[PDB]
Amino acid sequence: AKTMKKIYVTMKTLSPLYTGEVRREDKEAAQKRVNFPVRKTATNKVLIPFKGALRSALEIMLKAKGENVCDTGESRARPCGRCVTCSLFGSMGRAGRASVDFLISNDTKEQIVRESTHLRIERQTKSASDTFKGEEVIEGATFTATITISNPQEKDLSLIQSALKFIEENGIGGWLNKGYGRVSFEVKSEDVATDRFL
């Protein structure tokens, strides 16, 4: 109540990074020149959804330990409001303590977003059956996100770093099976009295 944990996360891409474009008008405006545009801001910066990555990472790893953590993965599921991901990332009756910012890049599109040419090759003829263009964020591109945790316990730091190593192992964004989105995280943590604006 009197303290907030602040987690300044700086993430740098060790691989091509694709997350999908979300806005319908931006997608349909860039479904002509490219067929898989990446998520952009209107300030032309790349957005990555970060909360679901951490929440999924924590839920798989905590079900692996056998803790009684729920799963908000299946269709129309229920946060039980009693687990440690339910305490951290929220339930339907209570909000999440860890407010997780979007992964905001420090560069714009012409510096990190590149169009591409992805293919589908016939197995017998060894010829390109299909061609489609898709934007990606380059390797070495770096992004920032601030995770702010109100009412901190002892183990929020360890769970958030553990989720970040799981995100490094799996990837973040889309096309994760093709090698996209493999990144590296750096974390600067700081304890905060909530009244520092006064």
Site for Zn ion in 45-84 (CB under 5 A): 70, 79-80, 83
Q: What one-character DSSP code corresponds to residue 178?
A: G
The answer to whether residues 30 and 21 touch, using CB atoms and an 8 Å cutoff, is yes
Per rule CB under 8 A, is residue 19 in the interface with its own copies? no
**Least Cβ distance, residue 166 to other proteins (angstroms):** 19
Cβ neighbours of 189 (radius 10 Å): 15
Stretch that binds other proteins, among 60-68, 93-101, 116-124, 167-175 (CB under 8 A): 93-101
Residue 32 binding target from Zn ion, its own copies, other proteins, none, CB below 5 to 8 Å by type: other proteins
Residue 152 binding target from Zn ion, other proteins, its own copies, none, CB below 5 to 8 Å by type: none
Which residues are CB-neighbours of 137 under 8 A, at least 6 positions away?
Answer: 13, 16, 17, 18, 19, 38, 46, 105, 112, 113
Q: Which of 26, 71, 115, 168 binds other proteins (CB under 8 A)?
A: 26
Per rule CB under 8 A, is residue 51 in the interface with other proteins? yes
The answer to whether residues 170 and 56 touch, using CB atoms and an 8 Å cutoff, is no
Using CB under 8 A as the binding rule, the residues of this chain from 49 to 88 that contact its own copies are 49-52, 56, 59-65, 71-77
Give the dihedral sign, CA 178/158/6/151: positive
